[PDB]
Amino acid sequence: HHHGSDLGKKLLEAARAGQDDEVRILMANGADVNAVDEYGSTPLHLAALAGHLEIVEVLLKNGADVNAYDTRGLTPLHLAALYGHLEIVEVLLKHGADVNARDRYGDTPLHLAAELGHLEIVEVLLKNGADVNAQDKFGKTAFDISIDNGNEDLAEILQKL
Ligand SMILES: [Cl-]
CA of 130 to the centre of ligand 1 (A): 19
CA of 84 to the centre of ligand 1 (A): 7
Say if CB 7 and CB 25 are below 8 A apart: no
C-alpha closest to that of 58 among 19, 23, 11, 93: 23
CA of 45 to the centre of ligand 1 (A): 13
CA of 161 to the centre of ligand 1 (A): 22
Amino acid identity at 35 = A
Q: Is 6 helix (H, G, I), strand (E, B) or coil?
A: helix
Experimentally, the structure was elucidated by X-ray
**CATH topology classification for 1-161:** 1.25.40
| Domain boundaries of the chain, sorted by first residue | 1-161
Say if CB 1 and CB 30 are below 8 A apart: yes
CA of 52 to the centre of ligand 1 (A): 7
**Cα–Cα distance between 40 and 34 in angstroms, integer?**
10
Say if CB 130 and CB 97 are below 8 A apart: no
C-alpha closest to that of 155 among 107, 109, 123: 123
**Cα–Cα distance between 70 and 34 in angstroms, integer?**
12
CA of 57 to the centre of ligand 1 (A): 11
Say if CB 7 and CB 1 are below 8 A apart: yes
Say if CB 110 and CB 125 are below 8 A apart: yes
What is the dihedral angle through the alpha carbons of 15, 55, 21, 10, rounded to the nearest 10 degrees? 20
CA of 56 to the centre of ligand 1 (A): 10
Rounded alpha-carbon distances, angstroms, from residue 74 to 25, 66, 103, 106, 139: 28, 12, 5, 10, 19
Q: How far apart are the first and last CA of the chain?
A: 44
CA of 48 to the centre of ligand 1 (A): 8
CA of 143 to the centre of ligand 1 (A): 24
CA of 88 to the centre of ligand 1 (A): 4
CA of 118 to the centre of ligand 1 (A): 12
